[PDB]
Amino acid sequence: GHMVTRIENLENAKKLWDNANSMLEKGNISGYLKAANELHKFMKEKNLKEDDLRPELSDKTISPKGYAILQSLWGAASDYSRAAATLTESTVEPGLVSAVNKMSAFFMDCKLSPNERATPDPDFKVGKSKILVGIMQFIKDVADPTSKIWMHNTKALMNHKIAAIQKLERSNNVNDETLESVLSSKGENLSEYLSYK
């Protein structure tokens, strides 16, 4: 019955968590995010909460590295979500980015009780520009091909911003001002609207 079905869903949910944790532990940002999304979608679909899984993960561990990447993801996502809420538009992109924050916190909260504290390694830093590209890559890969941010195709505008951040990296001109310029843009100065194409 539905209780046995729930046990079986939690076994699969534990597998999905472990996949996310293993991506995390390798420092793969977009792919952690792919796996976090899959976990979170499954749990939502099966009416399962963090509290339902947490007793099943007593034999699992998020490492200090893991927590460090998680806190880095949170801070970059936080800033991006806020910086993307502009007078041009403030629904689509902030929502996409805020959802990244939610799915990643969900993954964390499945293991850690939210009443109790992350233990990040204060020396493990992932570069903010790499985190931001990872977020954009996740968004681009999961977006519907017809989805738009303002007048621009969402995938194409992600590719545009990813390129912008990589150009800043190559020229060693990454700072919070140059980054904000990319995060807050809706391609208002481009020569035409970006298409799915």
HEC-encoded secondary structure of the chain? CHHHHHHHHHHHHHHHHHHHHHHHHCCCHHHHHHHHHHHHHHHHHCCCCHHHHHHHHCCCCCCHHHHHHHHHHHHHHHHHHHHCCCCCCCCHHHHHHHHHHHHHHHHHHHHCCCCCCCCCCCCCCCCHHHHHHHHHHHHHHHCCCCCEECCEEHHHHHHHHHHHHHHHHHCCCCCHHHHHHHHHCCCCCCCCCCCCC
- What is the CB neighbour count within 10 angstroms for residue 112? 19
Gap between the Cα atoms of 132 and 95, Å rounded: 15
Gap between the Cα atoms of 164 and 182, Å rounded: 7
Cβ neighbours for 181, distance < 8 A, ≥ 6 positions apart: none
Looking at residue 41, its amino acid is: K
- CA 166, distance to chain mean position in Å, is 19
Gap between the Cα atoms of 110 and 29, Å rounded: 19
Cβ neighbours for 2, distance < 8 A, ≥ 6 positions apart: none
Contact predicate 106/123, CB 8 Å = no
- The count of residues in the chain is 197
Query: In Å, how far are 6, 67, 93, 94, 132 from 41, measured between CA atoms?
Result: 15, 22, 20, 19, 22
Number of domains in the chain: 1
Query: CATH number for the domain including 91?
Result: 1.20.1260.70
Contact predicate 23/35, CB 8 Å = yes
List the one residue out of 101, 103, 93 whose CA is nearest residue 35.
103
> Sign (positive/negative) of CA torsion 20, 41, 53, 114?
positive
Q: Which domain holds residue 76?
A: 1-197
Gap between the Cα atoms of 105 and 98, Å rounded: 11
Contact predicate 77/29, CB 8 Å = no
**Which tokens belong to 69?**
């990447």
Cα 182-185-188 angle, rounded to 5 deg? 135
Query: In Å, how far are 17, 45, 47, 56, 106 from 39, measured between CA atoms?
Result: 6, 10, 12, 14, 9
Resolution limit, Å: 1.8
CA dihedral 182, 32, 38, 62 (to 10 degrees): -130
Solved using: X-ray
DSSP bridge pairs for 152: 149
- CA 57, distance to chain mean position in Å, is 22
Contact predicate 91/186, CB 8 Å = no
